[PDB]
Design a protein around this ligand. Structure first.
Ligand SMILES: Nc1nc2cc(CN3C(=O)c4cc(F)ccc4[C@]34CCN(Cc3ccc(F)cc3)C4=O)[nH]c2cc1F
Ligand SMILES: Nc1nc2cc(CN3C(=O)c4cc(F)ccc4[C@]34CCN(Cc3ccc(F)cc3)C4=O)[nH]c2cc1F
Ligand SMILES: CSC[C@H]1O[C@@H](n2cnc3c(N)ncnc32)[C@H](O)[C@@H]1O
Ligand SMILES: CSC[C@H]1O[C@@H](n2cnc3c(N)ncnc32)[C@H](O)[C@@H]1O
Lengths: 625, 625
């Protein structure tokens, strides 16, 4: 179930080592490429002219074994940021040599340590190696939760351990990582191998690593407790951490000697398996979502574009949404039509944007459970979908449903509606121009008519995700602005991220709109109180909608409709990441803009520092009218 | 084995039709999306306001069935290039409607006919559809080998069939295709469905379709002969054509009614299977090559770059090459050392570019079968490979082999060589700068010393491939010249192409070079007599090398070393395709250029029309010294 490997810093025979490791159930082996103690000179004679082979032959394993089962390790003596000029220069040449040999073997990953603050020259050498030739080899940066200096035993007489609560000081290992990856300019080849300590730090220190590219989680043998049976286990603190790490789907590495000598070394791995099996299973949401983790997709525009058959199919495969629509209409029928006017009053319903007709069906079910008479129209502009409607209408529905093949803004209605039902909402509610469409369809609603939905609101929340930022970055395309990708929203299942503040309402719309000279342009200022140090990369967008009264749909995490999976969150990126100290307020500004042809959003951060205004004049992103 | 489908222009029940087709062993079904006879008006009333559904519902099949098993067909009444303005306008609207519905269903392919010369407005509408939205749906252009007018029965009294040999006139259906795809600007979505006739045309007419994107081969039932048993078969003419088509791996479509009424419809398909099984099986070359058909790869530069382990591995997995090297050295030892000086004379061999040491081994085998004494050096600049050499040398070889870790141009030799052995040849021979390296290593050769190889030559041949041209086109990258991809050679297994003329020698090099002030710059004019109409897209490059005397290696098709698969051909593209009439000479000019840092090629076509000079000053492509 769980993908696990073994860290060793001693390999006397490479073939024999693997065999043992593989027999214990490990998937891969982290090991040195040159002997850890084999220190090499590159400048001063005569040690530079040392004869003989420098390491093992590549022939000792097959090409496939190198490619899948081995993870390289930088030798410990290599210190590129040494104060001594000689050791620096030597460590440079040695680092390149080891990294080059790693690429020669075609290793999938290679471990480098972050065990101090200044890793500038380390970063400069690695970056150079990345920009030499072509390779897909990952680089896992070995970085501890807690720095070695901060978890040392208080046993030095004239140098006691810091007994002071230093909020910023306990987050230092993240700052080590942050600076390194910034210098390297957010390379997608550079990821984190997070080393877990005996004493876990405060909760904030761990939350720091949310939204970071964690590929490995190194577990020492020392941190394992022993149970009554006499086999390795972990604390309830560590258990909760491993449970969190299993959601990220990281690869767990075991390092250190067998402290549980009486038992096998498989026991450690068997415990991780034990934890893997013993987790809360994936719900309908996470079942379906499994696959689209942090996958950027362009927001659908069913007005500008005509949706495909299989796009409508996946909409229809959400029974919770339509049951809510069914219930919404059901109640509205009872309110508008009394019991004494059951078979006198026929309500005029108008599904605006009928698609392949899930609402038409729902409206039929709603009328039957209510036991009230209805007259249905099914307005749909997409002519490909209208083919589906008419075939259904001929076979199943009949003359009760009148299929109209038109835009709702254009259509001249032969009758006014008591209810209009729509499904024109995207992940940011109004991103499919539901306001404009329903405004244009408003004239053929009765003066006392109802709209379903009657209201919808969009929400925003600041997020830190070095993953998603790096994902957007990689959406640069030929023949357009170099930074166009940052000035456009994405539909994405947000997974590896950190929500820095609680969602707040952005834009609200009410139908039918009764405000004279109806304007759908907006400008919203939001202030998000941050309680942690972090780096803002964008703003996650959600929405809520009121169908009728107490009938609602929502993708806002705290009020999320259970089971529903018809809308993933939306992501508004920013060009440049913005550092945010604990106590500081993130201030974002959002505009909804329009002309006769297009609608778009612009946005800007104004605190703690200013960003550029994103998507001015909809240059990078527009929504078609 | 063979991928086959069924063409129908009559589908009364879509579900039942598939069942029958699937039971007969067909993989997919070509069918209409709207009823062939269902002609629709879009302008004039009242026919434009025709009620009811326009076609079948998408719900009759599953999404997956549409995506894999159905191929769309444009209705026959749709004529976008009609002389009548009304029929034109109507056919435009209808064409878009059908194409849009095809995309709605998510069909993998869609058939459009090329049954006349002028298909300009057809091309204009299709191109518009391609540039509307995003889809991966292919478009198969139905084009006959022989035009309907040219295969009609000579049964009209006052209009007899052309009994004249019109060389250009019999190639007209290709010109139909050529013009169409040119208008559409070589879209990768547009391919050919070649319709085979009863009487096959002349051989030249068929050769015209070499290097064209043929995805389907439509076979009417009428063209099938009947055997003594009373089941469908094909002529020896058609058999050879199908054998050629099986190499291209096209999908065979069966069209028309069952003329063999007594037998099943599976019999037709079973015959294609019968042919599929009964072909000459793939040799060692085609066995290994299967996968890299028309796959563009960048030429290796083992001087500038350090080759990976698995790059050396695949070199070593060619036993024919080294057996030739073994035999080459074997003979040279016997010539240089007589029988009476068997154990007096030790020959000094020097493998220049030893890699992981296949030649060192071969030199050992060659000396043993010859029974002569040798002293080996193993010069290698790549330090990663030197690790392999030294481990081998320690374990196996010993002090007979002296591993040197240096550039051969730099290395100060402590002894002069009787033989130097090298493996510095690429697909265009001198594209790895074997001339420069061996010139720089020439000083430590004895005055009577031998070089293996002693000579090598590069060859060029003009090719027509609309596939490969379109492949290169798609190698456009951000942040460089828009046409850089055309000014650089590619290593590629040439498959779907047409060789327009016989290869001719381009550049030759002899080692040891004894010409004062050795210049490796060159300028070569070649004239290629073409005997067919075609469109030049590039120049395939090959090479021959003389190891010693009668010991040679070659990838030139006519003199190709049997079994060897260590070099695929190289491809020099051109920016713009060049039309070439039968009888015309293709004149190409090739330069080998250099400065102190780089070596590169430039090239230009000078007849029948001039091209631009490609890669001036090595702007787009250089080979590193
Ligand atoms: N009018 C409507 N608009 C909308 C707008 C949406 C959201 N949406 C996109 O914008 C979008 C853009 C894309 F490129 C791809 C997919 C989407 C979705 C639709 C489905 N889906 C969830 C999902 C996808 C995959 C999955 F394995 C599980 C769940 C989204 O995120 N759903 C509507 C339903 C309506 F009726
Ligand atoms: N010094 C040498 N140079 C050379 C130069 C070559 C040719 N070459 C490339 O340039 C090249 C460039 C690439 F991106 C990828 C591959 C190649 C090859 C090497 C192997 N191969 C054949 C093949 C590949 C794959 C296959 F499934 C079957 C056969 C080529 O075409 N082979 C040498 C061997 C030497 F000893
Ligand atoms: C069921 S998803 C929403 C549906 O509304 C349709 N739609 C969107 N805008 C309009 C409009 N202005 N008039 C009619 N249908 C519309 C879309 O084509 C889609 O089928
Ligand atoms: C076996 S493929 C050719 C080999 O020659 C080596 N080589 C290429 N140019 C030189 C050079 N100038 N000096 C030494 N080895 C070389 C390459 O590193 C490769 O291993």
């Amino acid at each position: 179930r769980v993908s696990s490997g073994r860290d060793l810093n001693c390999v006397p025979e490479i073939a024999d080592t693997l065999g043992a490791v593989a027999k214990q159930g490990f998937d891969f082996l982290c090991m040195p490429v040159f002997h850890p103690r084999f220190k090499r000179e590159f400048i001063q004679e005569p040690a530079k002219n040392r004869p003989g082979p420098q390491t093992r032959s590549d022939l000792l394993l097959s090409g496939r074994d190198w490619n899948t089962l081995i993870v390289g390790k930088l030798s410990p003596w290599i210190r590129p940021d040494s104060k001594v000029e000689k050791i620096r220069r030597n460590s440079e040449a040695a680092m390149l040599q080891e990294l080059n040999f790693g690429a020669y073997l075609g290793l999938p990953a290679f471990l480098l340590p972050l065990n101090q603050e200044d890793n500038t020259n380390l970063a400069r050498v690695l970056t150079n190696h990345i920009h030499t030739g072509h390779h897909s080899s990952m680089f896992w940066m070995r970085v501890p939760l807690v720095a070695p200096e901060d978890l040392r035993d208080d046993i030095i007489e004239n140098a006691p351990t810091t007994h002071t609560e230093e909020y910023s000081g306990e987050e230092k290992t993240w700052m080590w990582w942050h600076n390194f990856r910034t210098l390297c300019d957010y390379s997608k080849r550079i990821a984190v191998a997070l080393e877990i300590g005996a004493d876990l730090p405060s909760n904030h220190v761990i939350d720091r690593w949310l939204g970071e590219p964690i590929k490995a989680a190194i577990l020492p043998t020392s941190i394992f407790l022993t149970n009554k049976k006499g086999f390795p286990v972990l604390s309830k603190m560590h258990q909760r951490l491993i449970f969190r790490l299993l959601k990220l789907e990281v690869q767990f590495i075991i390092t250190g000697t067998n402290h549980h000598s009486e038992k096998e070394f498989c026991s450690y791995l068997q415990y991780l398996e034990y934890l893997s099996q013993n987790r809360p299973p994936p719900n309908a949401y996470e079942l379906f979502a499994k696959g689209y983790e942090d996958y950027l997709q362009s927001p659908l525009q069913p007005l500008m574009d005509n949706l495909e058959s299989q796009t409508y199919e996946v909409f229809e495969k959400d029974p919770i949404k339509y049951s809510q629509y069914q219930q919404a209409i059901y109640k509205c029928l009872l309110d508008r039509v009394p019991e004494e006017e059951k078979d006198t009053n026929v309500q005029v319903l108008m599904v605006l944007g009928a698609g392949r007709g899930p609402l038409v069906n729902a409206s039929l079910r709603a009328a039957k459970q209510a036991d009230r008479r209805i007259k249905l129209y099914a307005v749909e502009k997409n002519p490909n979908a209208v083919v589906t409607l008419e075939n259904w209408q001929f076979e199943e529905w009949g003359s009760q449903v009148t299929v109209v093949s038109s835009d709702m803004r254009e259509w001249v209605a032969p009758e006014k509606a008591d209810i209009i039902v729509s499904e024109l909402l995207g992940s940011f509610a109004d991103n499919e121009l539901s306001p404009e469409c329903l405004d244009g369809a408003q004239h053929f609603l009765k003066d006392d008519g109802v709209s379903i939905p009657g209201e919808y609101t969009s929400f925003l929340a600041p997020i830190s995700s070095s993953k998603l930022y790096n994902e957007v970055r990689a959406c640069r395309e030929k023949d357009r602005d170099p930074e166009a990708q940052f000035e456009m929203p994405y539909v994405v299942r947000l997974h590896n991220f950190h929500q820095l503040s609680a969602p707040q309402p952005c834009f609200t719309f009410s139908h039918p709109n009764r405000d004279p000279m109806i304007d759908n342009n907006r400008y919203c200022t939001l202030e998000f109180p941050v309680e942690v140090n972090t780096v803002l990369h964008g703003f996650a967008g959600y929405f809520e909608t009121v169908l009728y009264q107490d009938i609602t749909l929502s993708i806002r995490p705290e009020t999320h409709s259970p089971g529903m999976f018809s809308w993933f969150p939306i992501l508004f990126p920013i060009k440049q990441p913005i550092t945010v100290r604990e106590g500081q307020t993130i201030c974002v500004r959002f505009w909804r803009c329009s002309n006769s042809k297009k609608v778009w959003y612009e946005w800007a951060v104004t605190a703690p520092v200013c960003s550029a205004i994103h998507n001015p004049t909809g240059r990078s992103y527009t929504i078609g009218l």
